[PDB]
Amino acid sequence: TIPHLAIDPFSLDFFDDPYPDQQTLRDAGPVVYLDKWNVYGVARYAEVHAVLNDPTTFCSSRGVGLSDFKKEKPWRPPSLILEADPPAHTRPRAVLSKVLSPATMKTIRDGFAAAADAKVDELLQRGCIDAIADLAEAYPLSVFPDAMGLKQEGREHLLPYAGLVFNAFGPPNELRQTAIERSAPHQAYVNEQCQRPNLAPGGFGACIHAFTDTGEITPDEAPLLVRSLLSAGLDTTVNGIGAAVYCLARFPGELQRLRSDPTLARNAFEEAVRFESPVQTFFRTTTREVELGGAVIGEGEKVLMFLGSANRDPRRWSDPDLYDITRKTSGHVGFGSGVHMCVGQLVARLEGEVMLSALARKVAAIDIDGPVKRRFNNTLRGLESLPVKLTPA
Ligand code: HEM
Ligand SMILES: O=C(O)c1ccc(CCCl)cc1
Ligand SMILES: [Cl-]
Ligand SMILES: [Mg+2]
Numbered sequence: 001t002i003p004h005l006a007i008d009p010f011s012l013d014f015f016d017d018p019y020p021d022q023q024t025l026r027d028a029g030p031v032v033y034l035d036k037w038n039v040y041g042v043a044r045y046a047e048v049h050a051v052l053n054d055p056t057t058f059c060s061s062r063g064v065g066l067s068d069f070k071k072e073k074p075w076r077p078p079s080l081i082l083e084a085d086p087p088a089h090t091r092p093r094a095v096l097s098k099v100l101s102p103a104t105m106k107t108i109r110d111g112f113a114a115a116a117d118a119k120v121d122e123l124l125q126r127g128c129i130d131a132i133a134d135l136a137e138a139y140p141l142s143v144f145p146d147a148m149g150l151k152q153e154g155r156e157h158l159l160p161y162a163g164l165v166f167n168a169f170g171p172p173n174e175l176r177q178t179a180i181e182r183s184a185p186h187q188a189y190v191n192e193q194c195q196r197p198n199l200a201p202g203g204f205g206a207c208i209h210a211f212t213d214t215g216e217i218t219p220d221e222a223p224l225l226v227r228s229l230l231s232a233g234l235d236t237t238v239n240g241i242g243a244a245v246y247c248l249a250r251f252p253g254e255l256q257r258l259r260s261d262p263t264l265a266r267n268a269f270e271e272a273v274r275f276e277s278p279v280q281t282f283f284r285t286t287t288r289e290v291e292l293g294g295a296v297i298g299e300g301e302k303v304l305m306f307l308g309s310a311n312r313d314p315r316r317w318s319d320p321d322l323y324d325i326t327r328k329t330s331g332h333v334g335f336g337s338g339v340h341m342c343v344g345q346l347v348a349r350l351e352g353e354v355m356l357s358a359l360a361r362k363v364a365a366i367d368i369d370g371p372v373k374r375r376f377n378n379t380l381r382g383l384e385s386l387p388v389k390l391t392p393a
Helices: 012-016 019-028 045-052 090-099 102-126 132-148 155-168 174-181 184-193 204-213 219-232 235-250 252-260 262-276 345-362
Strands: 032-034 039-042 128-130 281-286 290-292 295-297 302-306 363-368 373-375 382-385 387-392
Touching (some): 039 045, 045 290, 102 132, 128 132, 132 155, 132 235, 132 382, 184 219, 235 252, 235 262, 235 363, 235 382, 252 262, 252 363
Antiparallel strands (some): 032 039, 281 302, 363 387
16 A cells, blocks of 8 residues: 655765655655665655644654664764653753744844854955855854854864764664764764853853753753754754755846845745755654554654655645745745744744845855755755855945
8 A cells, every 4th residue: 555665865866866756755655665764754745744743643752863762772862852752842842942032033133144244245355155165154153153152162073063963863874874983072072062161151052051940951951952052053054054045046036036125035045945955854753553644654663754855745835846035935844843843943044034135235146156066964955065156246
């Protein structure tokens, strides 16, 4: 009843161009079985959304990667938020929600915007730049580590650590095995910066530790919650901003519309999150026998959700393969959906908005003028290098 497919969604050929294989996954049926990894797969919007919004049946406490924490040891102590289910998930989630709250965005927006304008000004002086290293990476590195309260020393471990985290969600292929092999120095750095004395006053890290006296989290929970932000808070925005710039570079008509109305910057970034879906996939584990799209999935089964495929499903989206900065993007699953929906989405949207605003006001054209190189990761979709020429407005 359930179709069996041999597609490996974690192969380099798949990363290089996933869209034909994602249509195959969608059109094979609402639920498929991936023989390569012995997991179920859902690639249509409907089933992805349903799984995300039934955390009781499709749990996260057994891991959101391929590995089932009930069968294998996690490569690192489980996240108190990402790899937890209600009710244990609830209070750690509340603390991060308040640490990254709408009121908190008011305290950082001016500095984030100023750093975005300054970066674009700097890049326009050079003209020809790498939109990845020099923009998508450089800008988040210039605001987020400081917003965390990290010292300057050792920040070079942050991106390698994040690449490891997102590779570790994948199956035990070479990408994952090699990442874990090289992980020891990055884990040591990150874990040490999570301790209260190492987080500067007023930053996200110190604010997490400050919540340890309300009864929502205990002092011994704060380090791992800082670890969450150091895991998910940087490389995500790198690939989100990278996606947005890549879209504007490929679709000059949409850059011209953005220039004509810079207030579209926020929706232009949201559309880029849907269009590229930098965070591609996550797993759930069934806690009971469940019926999903006519298939009966047994207990203790892994279910792979194709977020990027759901965001291009023609059953849900009109012209899904078009980048449209005025599209009604509400409902896309690029940030997830439900109780685990990205708790840092306000930070991600703030960074994306202010950067796209700077480009909208300062840049007249974005022209690819060199070889485009893709970066391969078991969970993240994005570029290694994006040579562009920036023409000033
Ligand atoms: C374009 C940028 C980003 C994207 C596309 C993204 C994507 C996602 C997705 C899809 C989830 C759901 C995971 C699941 O359902 O299992 C998630 C959760 C999460 N994200 Fe984001 N994220 C981004 C930026 C950020 C930032 C900036 C932060 C922190 C500053 C962050 C921290 C988190 C955390 C802690 C969770 C776990 C939430 C929970 O389990 O309740 N992310 N993110
Ligand atoms: O709590 C964490 O350590 C964690 C949370 C979310 C993510 C992926 C979000 Cl795109 C990775 C790690
Ligand atoms: Cl760690
Ligand atoms: Mg419809």
